[PDB]
Amino acid sequence: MAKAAAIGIDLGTTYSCVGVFQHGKVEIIANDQGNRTTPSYVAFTDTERLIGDAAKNQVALNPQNTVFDAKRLIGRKFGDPVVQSDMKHWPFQVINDGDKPKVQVSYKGETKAFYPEEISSMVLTKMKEIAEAYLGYPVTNAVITVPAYFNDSQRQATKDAGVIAGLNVLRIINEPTAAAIAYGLDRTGKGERNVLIFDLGGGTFDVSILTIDDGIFEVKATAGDTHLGGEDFDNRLVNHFVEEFKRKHKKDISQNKRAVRRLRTACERAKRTLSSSTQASLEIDSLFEGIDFYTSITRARFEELCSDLFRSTLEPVEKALRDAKLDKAQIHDLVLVGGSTRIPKVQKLLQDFFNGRDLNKSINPDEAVAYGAAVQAAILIKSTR
Numbered sequence: 001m002a003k004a005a006a007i008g009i010d011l012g013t014t015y016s017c018v019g020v021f022q023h024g025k026v027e028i029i030a031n032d033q034g035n036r037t038t039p040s041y042v043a044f045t046d047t048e049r050l051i052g053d054a055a056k057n058q059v060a061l062n063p064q065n066t067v068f069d070a071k072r073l074i075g076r077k078f079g080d081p082v083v084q085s086d087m088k089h090w091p092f093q094v095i096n097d098g099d100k101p102k103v104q105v106s107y108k109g110e111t112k113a114f115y116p117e118e119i120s121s122m123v124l125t126k127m128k129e130i131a132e133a134y135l136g137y138p139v140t141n142a143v144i145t146v147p148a149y150f151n152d153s154q155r156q157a158t159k160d161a162g163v164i165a166g167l168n169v170l171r172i173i174n175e176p177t178a179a180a181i182a183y184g185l186d187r188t189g190k191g192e193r194n195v196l197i198f199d200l201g202g203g204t205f206d207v208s209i210l211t212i213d214d215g216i217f218e219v220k221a222t223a224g225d226t227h228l229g230g231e232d233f234d235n236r237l238v239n240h241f242v243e244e245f246k247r248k249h250k251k252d253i254s255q256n257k258r259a260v261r262r263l264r265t266a267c268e269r270a271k272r273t274l275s276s277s278t279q280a281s282l283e284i285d286s287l288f289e290g291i292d293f294y295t296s297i298t299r300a301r302f303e304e305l306c307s308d309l310f311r312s313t314l315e316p317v318e319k320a321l322r323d324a325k326l327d328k329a330q331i332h333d334l335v336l337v338g339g340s341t342r343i344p345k346v347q348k349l350l351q352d353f354f355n356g357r358d359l360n361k362s363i364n365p366d367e368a369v370a371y372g373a374a375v376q377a378a379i380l381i382k383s384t385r
């Protein structure tokens with residue numbers, strides 16, 4: 001029943017996803033708001049603790065007590081130059097508890113501090129409760145994914161997050177391995193297979209090169225930009241619309257925090273529309289000083305605004321190929337991971353770099369990692385019996 005059931009969790013920097021393999025198919029489980037992915041946000045308020053969508057929706061009104069990016073802190077020391085650099089950009093407080101970072105917040109009127117693994121365990125508890133509500137019984141066995149470059153301390157702290165959440169962690173697997181499992185790239189019989197995973201998320205970009213030799217996976221190279229993602233494209237749309245508002249009304253909205261956030265969420269939505277339409281419309285009632293902002297943007301203008309950012313994704317691909325000591329023609333499969341890989345210009349640039357090659361993209365790229373983890377979780381729980 002429950003002891004023979006296992007879930008696959010994609011614990012992401014910005015979004016998390018949960019899948020289950022049953023009756024020969026993977027089901028990506030929708031949350032109570034109908035969404036197949038849940039924001040990796042935890043809000044601490046005057047009355048409650050919010051997790052996910054409800055936490056992301058109140059981030060504007062409560063920025064000091066809304067924690068996100070815990071995956072950037074997990075398994076790291078306070079003194080780490082990565083932690084020190086990132087701290088300068090977060091609205092929540094990060095403190096030092098014996099060379100270990102803790103996030104300090106106000107909760108139910110009291111000052112409380114949390115380890116990154118306690119924050120990630122609250123996100124994991126939510127994913128577990130989403131699967132339980134879908135299945136009708138508690139599920140405790142789980143496969144949790146991590147980036148391929150995570151060291152032993154980061155993998156251990158992720159496993160500890162799973163323990164705190166009440167999960168029996170069957171295995172911690174690399175995100176590119178879960179993606180290659182989703183496409184069945186480990187069931188191609190004999191002979192070594194070279195796979196490139198192109199992972200463009202909300203706040204991070206990762207390129208991974210894997211060799212699959214008779215079922216066994218081997219990471220040959222990892223490259224990327226930890227500070228490049230979908231949110232940088234939204235910001236380029238934001239800057240354009242602020243300059244367009246200035247040309248039409250002779251008014252600068254940039255300093256008005258409410259006007260910029262409403263513009264930012266509308267730009268995120270418009271960006272997603274531009275993936276399947278050649279134009280998107282913004283309809284913001286009373287954006288600034290009672291002025292409605294009713295405009296449109298073509299896909300051509302959006303591609304111009306983000307041109308330099310899209311082209312920059314090809315340097316880590318070249319870097320990963322040189323590190324792996326492989327030429328383009330030696331790569332058997334190209335796999336797309338992350339919601340931003342849906343952008344037609346991103347697919348066009350990657351396909352042209354690989355000489356007109358076909359891309360593996362039939363599985364929702366924001367769900368491919370949870371899909372593969374759910375498959376691995378089923379295989380692992382069966383062998384356990």
Ligand SMILES: Nc1ncnc2c1nc(Cl)n2[C@@H]1O[C@H](CO)[C@@H](O)[C@H]1O
Nearest residue numbers: 201202230231272275338339340342
């Ligand atoms: N259809 C889409 N076209 C463009 N960007 C998309 C799309 N879907 C998502 Cl999600 N994203 C972005 O992916 C990230 C999450 O994986 C977010 O930045 C989201 O906007």
